[PDB]
């Protein structure tokens, strides 16, 4: 048997609404019974330790609720009969580790009296009240194998609608959208439900 190696690649994620979760790479098999503990603390308060389950040995979901705008220091402790070691510490504001819920209620309309025009409207996830949003808008013809995407720069700040143009006349289109913190620090949300619509000619 051997002593535990320093855990590495610690990274945390905060799905909107849920408690924070961190994951890490354990290291070379110890052949011994090794315990992992996720430590976390504000500069003024030690939070409850998080002990990794056997089922999920290299990941932990804390027991405290997520508080944005307050840096939290985090690290992992590994231990077995032969040794007790800790990972490097990371210190971040939970706000940069968010995975919003997908925008919902996506819908299409031809509110332009023109063909090459379609307007999408949707409802932003609740996290909008905390972070400014960025998006990826994808579209494709009803019968097409792959998606096309609208330039990222054209959908770089919070909005609840976008009007897509330069589309081919009398054509049906499918759409989907996803979002995340405007500065790119975080995780993309899952895609929204698809929405279709046809154009004039």
């Amino acid at each position: 048997g051997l002593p535990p190696e320093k855990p590495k690649n610690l990274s945390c994620i905060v799905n909107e609404g849920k408690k924070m979760r961190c994951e890490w790479d354990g290291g070379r098999e110890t052949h011994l019974e090794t315990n992992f503990t996720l430590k976390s603390e504000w500069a003024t308060h030690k939070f409850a330790d998080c002990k990794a389950k056997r089922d999920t040995p290299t990941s932990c979901t804390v027991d405290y609720s997520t508080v944005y705008f307050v840096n939290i220091e985090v690290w992992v402790e590994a231990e077995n009969a032969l040794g007790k070691v800790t990972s490097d510490h990371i210190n971040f504001d939970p706000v940069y580790k968010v995975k919003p819920n997908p925008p919902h209620n996506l819908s299409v309309i031809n509110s332009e009296e023109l063909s090459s025009i379609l307007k999408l409207t949707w409802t932003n996830p609740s996290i909008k009240s905390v972070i400014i949003l960025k998006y990826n808008i994808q579209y494709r013809t009803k019968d097409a194998s792959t998606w096309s995407q609208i330039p990222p720069e054209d959908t770089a700040s919070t909005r609840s609608s976008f009007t897509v143009q330069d589309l081919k006349p009398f054509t049906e289109y499918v759409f989907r959208i996803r979002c995340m913190k405007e500065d790119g620090k975080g995780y993309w949300s899952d895609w929204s439900e698809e929405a279709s619509g046809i154009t004039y000619e």
Binding site: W42, S65, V67, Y68, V70, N71, E73, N91
Partner: protein, 169 residues
Amino acid sequence: CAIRHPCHNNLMNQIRSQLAQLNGSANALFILYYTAQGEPFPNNLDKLCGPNVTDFPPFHANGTEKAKLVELYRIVVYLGTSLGNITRDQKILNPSALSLHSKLNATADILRGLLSNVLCRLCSKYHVGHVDVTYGPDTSGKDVFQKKKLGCQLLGKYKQIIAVLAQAF
């Protein structure tokens, strides 16, 4: 002023974000609260849910940064404790107002974070030594109705003061 590691270097911007956060959901917390109490609160908001600065800590938006943070600190503590009593009672009096309990805790969480950050700039920048105490006297001093009212007036005061605080930093 005991620290567990170096306080953050973007404190003032973070508390600003924290105040905005509070300010932007206070109205919803207030609304949730009276609506959950039922008659005679929804119809008599002005005399059952007004903003009374009782013993409530003061705030001079015209003060220095240090002076405002110290007042902000005593205010958060006061609100923080007032909020615990309110929720304690509300879980008993209105066991069904699930949404209400939830938003109460959510606001309590945001408030604790504010204390941490405020305490951090106050210690790191002004070497304050420590800040003086002031709590809300919940107590059993009141039949069910006085609780409900005191609660409703606190949130009323909270909604007003928070807005004043949100744009003074």
